[PDB]
Ligand binder design. Structure first.
Ligand SMILES: Nc1ncnc2c1ncn2[C@@H]1O[C@H](COP(=O)(O)OP(=O)(O)O)[C@@H](O)[C@H]1O
Ligand SMILES: Nc1ncnc2c1ncn2[C@@H]1O[C@H](COP(=O)(O)OP(=O)(O)O)[C@@H](O)[C@H]1O
Ligand SMILES: [Cl-]
Ligand SMILES: [Cl-]
Lengths: 277, 285
């Protein structure tokens, strides 16, 4: 019921270029909220502003009862950050990297040691506790960032494209951690993604973002209601690539997905490999 | 037809885990050669070994007439590296970042200044030459890494997923640079990718990689010949039929829940060979 994220006309300009054009939304406590959009939509810029790493041009943002602009240190203490810019030390082991982060936030003793091992067990890295992070996979390093961000018991976890670059097994396990954090620990998760399957499967609500704007917002089912119950693509709404969204070149038929909602709103798709290029 | 890259049973183990299981191939001079495979196939591990950034567990690799394992410094001087982890300083401008890399490799004077501006014009960043890299997008920073890797005139350019995370316009421009480097400058390009269109449109030859192994190797047309001329996915007219784990039926035909019909792509070759697709969003998950 309580709003743990409140954003009002959040804007970011890089010189004269508008990256984020005044986005607004709210996230309830214990919710998985996803920003779904393609590369270049303003997802990383938005998540950097919500986590205090980038100053907004204008607008307002409140995270966990605190003003992001006026109380960034109080906001940093209440949130977890897992971004593509890895801040792990390759020379230190997995356990050592998390002891460093734990002592920085004020934890210590046998209790900090137990917590680290528990969080390493939760992300399935307990067997690699005494192993250098230089010899770690991308998947392993991202699983270690999830465990590290949880040491200081944040209320909200911010994930910038959590499963980009990961194999299906690590990706499936990443979704289980997120799901378990929500359901078993009342955690709030704000994530950015261009994966329609990741947004449908995990998110309670989705904000579809395109060229710095929210172009649709609601539950995956409310968004899917904007398109038919059964869609056809043949090569009524004509698309730039030539096919028609309802003895030929290409015919496709399936149940609607959030990629079909993106095609319906913008005339193109979320993926890079799609016919748009 | 000189082989500028020769790889023989190149292996990489991380503890007891086998990331690359003994891969072999060769790349001709002036060729675009692509490693096509899904996330976790061993593409980044292979490209890090070929560029001297990661030591192999075993095997042999020769790049531009030099042994990768015994002459890494001579190999580094002859190749260009454009990977994910950038080395660009956000405080320095685009021109300044290029001047740093140029002076490190032994260049200087008016000639280095001209070559920087040329390379910035080639990647369409000349108008942002005196602009900080902190104020650059991802596409611009990747275009700057391409220009930076070319300062020391490498014979081979190594690209680890050149267009991942880019918009279609920057992606289309990235393909144009690669094509122009091969055709207009006799450049050899080794690239890793999980995009079936990128490998088809750019590569002369493709090595399909899956779980640390090369499972198919040839031109995109030789590989497409392994599947029908027209494929159907459904969940007398059937020439061949193959059931998939997800439940669908891969049918090869001549002239319900979900039906799809299109001409074969390298993703249909990957699904024919392995029973799963290249993308993350595919039904496999
Ligand atoms: N630091 C920056 N300086 C200038 N432009 C930027 C910067 N970061 C991103 N951009 C631009 O802002 C837009 C959104 O970028 P981004 O936040 O990275 O989106 P996404 O994460 O969804 O791919 C793009 O059109 C990109 O070119
Ligand atoms: N340093 C490492 N330590 C342990 N496992 C690793 C390491 N680097 C990569 N791996 C593993 O090797 C496999 C292949 O990795 P990678 O080369 O990055 O594949 P790709 O680039 O095609 O996605 C993956 O299963 C990955 O987890
Ligand atoms: Cl992707
Ligand atoms: Cl296999």
């Amino acid at each position: 019921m309580e709003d743990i994220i409140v954003v009002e006309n959040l804007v970011k300009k890089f010189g004269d270029f508008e990256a984020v054009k005044g986005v607004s939304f709210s996230v309830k406590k214990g919710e998985i909220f996803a920003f779904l959009g393609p590369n270049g939509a303003g997802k990383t810029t938005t998540i950097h502003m919500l986590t205090t790493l980038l100053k907004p041009t204008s607008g307002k943002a409140w995270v966990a009862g605190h003003d992001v602009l006026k109380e960034p240190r109080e906001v940093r203490r209440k949130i977890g950050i897992v971004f593509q810019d890895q801040s792990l030390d390759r020379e230190l082991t997995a356990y050592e990297n998390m002891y460093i982060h734990g002592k920085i936030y004020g934890y210590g003793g046998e209790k900090l040691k137990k917590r680290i091992l528990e969080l390493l067990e939760f992300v399935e890295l307990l067997e690699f506790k005494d192993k250098p992070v230089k010899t770690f996979s991308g998947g392993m390093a991202r699983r270690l960032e999830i465990a590290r961000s949880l040491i200081h018991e944040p209320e909200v976890l911010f994930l910038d494209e959590p499963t980009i670059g990961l194999d299906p097994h690590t990706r499936a396990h990443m979704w289980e951690y997120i799901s378990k954090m929500k359901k078993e620990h009342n955690m709030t998760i704000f994530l950015t993604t261009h994966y329609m399957d990741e947004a449908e499967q995990l998110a309670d609500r989705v904000a579809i973002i395109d060229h710095g704007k929210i172009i649709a917002l609601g539950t995956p089912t409310e968004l899917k209601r904007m398109v038919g119950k059964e869609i056809i693509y043949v090569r009524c709404r004509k698309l730039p690539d030539g096919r028609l969204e309802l003895k030929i070149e290409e015919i496709t038929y399936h149940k609607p997905t959030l990629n079909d909602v993106f095609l319906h709103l913008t005339g193109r798709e979320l993926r890079e490999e799609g016919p748009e290029n």
